[PDB]
Write a protein that binds this ligand. Structure first.
Ligand code: CL
Ligand code: K
Ligand code: K
Ligand code: K
Length: 233
């Protein structure tokens, strides 16, 4: 099989895993076994991984035309969704952990989950606005438009890495923090390689698809799977 076909096979394996983890996490949440904020963010992350695998299949099937651009856009948006859900968890866990350090005697702050969610949702909205702007100018159909979208993803990956770093510095024994940090490192590395690949040749579809699969693999293996495994024990 060609490279793009191998990438779709891998993404479909990840989507299969994601559907199964969604079922396990839902039962765990109904049984009082997982925190609601973490559950809701992992659920969003898994749904982005399912969408990524769908867009990748469409990209393989539509190398040209409007369906090609729509598959590329859907694929990039699902990558943004995975990073924003990672950012949401790291930010929320950090804010809660910081309050414990600065003032352990204070009551639960209701603003913290709302603050983490609002910040992560802003990135999703900003990306949708950027896509619309490039689509209106026509720049979306040129290589410079795709670079601008990948540069946005790289900046989001850097912000996600910073959030994961701050969270991991609070508790070095926190395994979820360690998984978010390593995933954020791999995701940033994958996007920096994709930006390099897009300058070296015209294989733009392969560059983005490769980054997309690496991003979903990192999230599944390093962030989601260990939480699910702990619930199984
Ligand atoms: Cl206090
Ligand atoms: K407190
Ligand atoms: K959301
Ligand atoms: K940690």
């Amino acid at each position: 099989m060609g490279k793009m076909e191998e990438l779709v096979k891998r993404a479909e394996e990840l989507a299969k895993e994601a559907k199964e983890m969604l079922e396990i996490l839902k039962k765990a949440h109904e049984e009082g076994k997982i925190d609601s904020f973490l559950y809701e963010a992992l659920k969003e992350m898994l749904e982005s991984i399912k969408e990524l695998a769908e867009a990748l299949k469409e990209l393989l099937e539509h190398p040209t035309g409007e369906k090609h651009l729509e598959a590329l856009i859907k694929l990039l948006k699902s990558m943004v969704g995975i990073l924003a859900s990672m950012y949401e968890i790291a930010r929320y866990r950090y804010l809660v952990g910081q309050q414990k350090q600065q003032d352990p005697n204070a009551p639960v702050d209701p603003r913290l989950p709302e603050e983490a969610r609002e910040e992560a949702e802003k990135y999703v909205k900003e990306f949708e606005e950027l896509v619309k702007k490039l689509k209106d100018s026509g720049k979306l159909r040129e290589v410079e438009g795709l670079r601008e979208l990948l540069e946005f993803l790289r900046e989001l990956a850097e912000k996600t890495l910073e959030a994961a770093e701050e969270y991991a510095k609070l508790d070095p024994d926190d395994e979820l923090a360690k998984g978010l940090l390593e995933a954020a490192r791999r995701i940033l590395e994958a996007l920096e390689r994709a930006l390099r690949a897009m300058e070296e040749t015209d294989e733009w579809d392969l560059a983005i698809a490769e980054a997309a699969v690496e991003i979903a693999e990192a999230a599944i293996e390093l962030v989601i799977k260990p939480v699910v495994e702990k619930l199984k024990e």
